[model samples]
Target: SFRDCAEVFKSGHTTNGIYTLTFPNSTEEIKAYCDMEAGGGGWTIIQRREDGSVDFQRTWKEYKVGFGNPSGEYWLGNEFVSQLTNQQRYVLKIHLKDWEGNEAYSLYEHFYLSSEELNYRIHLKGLTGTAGKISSISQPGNDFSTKDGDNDKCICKCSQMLTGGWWFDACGPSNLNGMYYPQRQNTNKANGIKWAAWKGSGYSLKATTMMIRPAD
Candidate 1:
């Protein structure tokens, strides 16, 4: 419940490491990586895709709660995310890497998730980055969905078709949660780390880092 990783810096911790922090509305303390580098140096890492070691094709319950490890790759749970955002404003930073040694990042100046009652809808504003406009991924007011949930308006069952949980709309053009393929070019319709807006569909990314921090 420490709110986010910003406290790690406020507390004089310059090193990025694994930390456990309690939440105001939690059953127990949650553990995650404290990202002390990058823009603000206090980013709470939401997800990381360095390798295909962890299975991201999780269930609604798994995604709602969370999966993977902060040490490697992970999803920082939608429930905890909703709580953090509603408490205050935050920004979403997506850092991407490719096999060609190319790196790019997209920043959403203002970002937050609506409560689960609203299906954990995502709200994003002020997009800026080297990764193109990437609006298909934001699509304002898009609801989060897993393979089992069809909250997206797309009749194709976006999450299911996209092959991972995400704020999908009409299937995809972006899915960082997709399969992390061994090859730079994926065989899957939308390979893992798919940010089609930047690399085109099925081109697996070499790495991706999703983190957030206080807007103010």
Candidate 2:
């Protein structure tokens, strides 16, 4: 089974910004962010630039906890964002907090575009530490072309198609039960939250899925 290499703390945190990945195809100097919040909550953002450079980053601390629901408030004001480009295809993953300490963690997906009318919809679930570790459900793979490559695709129209949930099929298949096989474990674990995804559109979306443990 896949285990955590390092312990995750509260208030969004992530790995390095740049990465060199070969799996699913060779992606040079790709950036990725893995945010983790206290009480097992956080966000993740991954993007590929038009120049073929990738970016990944994370931030758990969003704002101080207030109001009745610690989970509702943006404790520490944690948020993950990746700049977008005209290029198409990207992926993002998140592991919701589901543990004994904190009952549950929720994930919300939001799509942003210059044009009006939304374009995509995503239903992400929370994963509890006790409810069988959260596994990879879907993620985007790397397929960035060289900066000098032809820019034939239209990012504007493509962005709308993606946000509308019309181009999801082109993204790729979602992994099912990443715990069964050894390969699956590596794949899921690599996704950060035990969640994996295939390539997707170039548009950018913000994820606010942080949870603060109940008052002790």
Q: Estimate each model's TM-score.
A: 0.93, 0.20
Per-residue lDDT of candidate 1, residues 22-141 (tens digit): 675665778878888656588898889998478888998888888898899889888888888888888988889988889988888888888888888889888899887765375766
lDDT of 2 by residue, 1-216 (tens): 100101122322333222221112223222223234332332222211111111121111111111112222111211111112111222222232211223222232322211111122222334333223432223222121111221113333321222211122232232111111122232323122222221111212122232221111
In candidate 1, what residue range of length 10 has the lowest lDDT sum? 183-192
Model 2 score (lDDT): 0.22
TM-score (C-alpha) between model 1 and the true structure = 0.93
List residue ranges in candidate 1 displaced over 4 A. 25-27
lDDT of all predictions: 0.80, 0.22
| Residue pairs with backbone atoms closer than 3 Å in model 1 (clashes) | 1-22, 1-23, 178-192, 179-192
How many pairs in model 2 have backbone atoms within 3 A of each other, for residues 3 or more apart or on separate chains, i.e. clashes?
Answer: 44
